[PDB]
A = this chain, B = another copy of it.
Amino acid sequence: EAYRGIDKPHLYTLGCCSLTAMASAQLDALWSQLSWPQTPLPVLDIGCGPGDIARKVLAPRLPAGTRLVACDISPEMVDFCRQHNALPGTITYELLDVVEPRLEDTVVWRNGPFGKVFCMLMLHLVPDNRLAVKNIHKLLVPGGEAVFSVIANMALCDAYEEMAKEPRWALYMQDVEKFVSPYQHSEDPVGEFRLLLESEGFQVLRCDLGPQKVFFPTAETHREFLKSVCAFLYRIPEEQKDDFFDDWLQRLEKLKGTSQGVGRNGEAEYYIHLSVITALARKF
């Protein structure tokens, strides 16, 4: 987040084998409610990450001849996409900031207009949500749909706000509220997100909130994945990087955002808990 997005894309694909199945289950619940034009239009994926939802989930489910455009503010992610999950003739991985001042000067804008825009687990990394909904509203054809997978609240955000009070850190965390989801302290996340979408010319067709778990088979891939989604590590020097992490990870099982379980085969299971708002809108 902030300066670029999630660097180190290698550590993030450790959650592919789990995050792929999660969004693949969310989209299956909404895919029947999605209407499509006769002649296909380009489809956009915002905050595509290492391009696994774009390649392994979105692309197999799109109609034939539908071209896909996947963007991410972090370069390292978009280069990881074009090298591993690179799907020729369908997916075109590009760079874009969803709250770009000059959207009309980007490659993604001129690939448009787009029929559908999938914005998955990335709108919590955007402090200015209404500006991001605006730019998505510019990119959609009238009648085009948008699919949101916004994270309402999670213990990772509170662990950020608790660490921001440490004079040890503090200096690097003066803007902690801009690294926290805007629906973190919201008493009604579904209502505020339904109001925000409709306040930008959208027809909210469906909007629900539920808990989610992120499965990890091994112990270290649970740890190494949390290294990537730690948004403050790019500001900390090396002598305190490994200390910011342990301070963070300790404050997580305190807040019970992460957990460890047992398997039917007896093996150890590792989890990450968080709430997700799922939305389906349509431009007028």
Interface residues of A (CB under 8 A from B): 7-11, 13-14, 16-17, 20-21, 24, 52, 55-57, 60-61, 76, 79-80, 83-85, 215, 217-218, 220-221, 224, 263-265, 267-269
Instruction: Check A55–B265 contact: CB distance below 8 A.
Output: no
Instruction: Check A221–B21 contact: CB distance below 8 A.
Output: no
Q: Which residue on B lies nearest to A16, using beta carbons? A: B17
Given A221-B221, A224-B218, decide whether A14 and B17 contact each other with a Cβ distance below 8 A: yes
Name which of A24, A61, A265 has the most chain B CB atoms within 10 A of its CB: A265
Given A17-B17, A85-B21, decide whether A265 and B218 contact each other with a Cβ distance below 8 A: no
Identical copies of this chain, number: 2
Instruction: Check A10–B264 contact: CB distance below 8 A.
Output: no
Given A11-B217, A218-B10, A224-B218, decide whether A84 and B21 contact each other with a Cβ distance below 8 A: yes
Residues of the B chain whose Cβ atoms lie less than 8 Å from the Cβ of A217: 10-11, 13-14
Given A24-B56, A60-B60, decide whether A263 and B17 contact each other with a Cβ distance below 8 A: no
Chain A contact residues: over half helix, strand or loop, or mixed? Answer: helix
Q: Complex: how many Å from CA A123 to CA B7?
A: 39
Residues of the B chain whose Cβ atoms lie less than 8 Å from the Cβ of A60: 24, 57, 60-61
CB of A80 to closest CB in B, whole Å: 7
Q: List 18 A-B contacts (CB under 8 A).
A: A7-B265, A10-B218, A10-B267, A14-B217, A16-B17, A17-B52, A21-B55, A21-B56, A21-B84, A21-B85, A60-B61, A79-B264, A79-B265, A80-B264, A80-B265, A84-B215, A218-B220, A218-B224
Name which of A7, A21, A268 has the most chain B CB atoms within 10 A of its CB: A21
CB of A73 to closest CB in B, whole Å: 15
